[PDB]
Amino acid sequence: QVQLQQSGAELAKPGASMKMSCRASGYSFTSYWIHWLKQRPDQGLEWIGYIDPATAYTESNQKFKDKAILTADRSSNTAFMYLNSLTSEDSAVYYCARESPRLRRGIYYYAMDYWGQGTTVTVSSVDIQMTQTPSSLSASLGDRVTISCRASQDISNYLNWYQQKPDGTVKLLIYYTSRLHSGVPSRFSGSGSGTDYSLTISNLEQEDIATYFCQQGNTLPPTFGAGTKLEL
């Protein structure tokens, strides 16, 4: 079983540097990319970059190009991220996540199929826009519910959906508009095309209470929606 284990919470001084790690077990580390992401209090996620462990090649978001450096060591099955010139804007939860198996030779989904548990950092002494509606939505057990997602440009069906629980745990539910991931119960379904997409949950259960994110992976950098909170 795939597993990603991240390092423990740290505090730091303004102006300093720091280093955090992500240890892999239960699969061939050199066969899939590792991604890094940032999430601020009560906000959506931002994508920082990825590294290919087999070749050491890296890709970075222009917004983080002076802020972060990514590395990997194959023998110890571990990836790393280094940050510099820390400010209060840098206090956040940081995550690592694995890239899913490809679509065909040279064509990836940009769907993150397994996630680490997050590291909390405290500092103390044109992009494609996604729009999710509504921002929160209440329902009762056994109901049918649908949520909507729009992008600012044709994303040609490269649209993915994730679920985040109150304790931070993140998982992939659907990739490439309508494909279920391993272990997802078939009461989850999705549809769309062009710029307009939706997710539908049939026969709600109490373990479905959470926050839901959409994400395009047509063009770099990957961008996320701001979330829909689903409550009883």
Numbering used by the authors: 1 to 125, 399 to 505
Verbatim from the authors:
The monoclonal antibody (mAb) 14F7 is a murine IgG that binds selectively to NeuGc GM314. One such antigen is the ganglioside NeuGc GM3, which contains the sialic acid N-glycolyl neuraminic acid. Still, NeuGc GM3 fulfils the criteria of being a tumour-specific extracellular marker, which makes it a very potent antigen for targeted cancer immunotherapy. A scFv is an antibody-derived fragment that contains the heavy chain variable region (VH) and the light chain variable region (VL) tethered covalently by a linker.
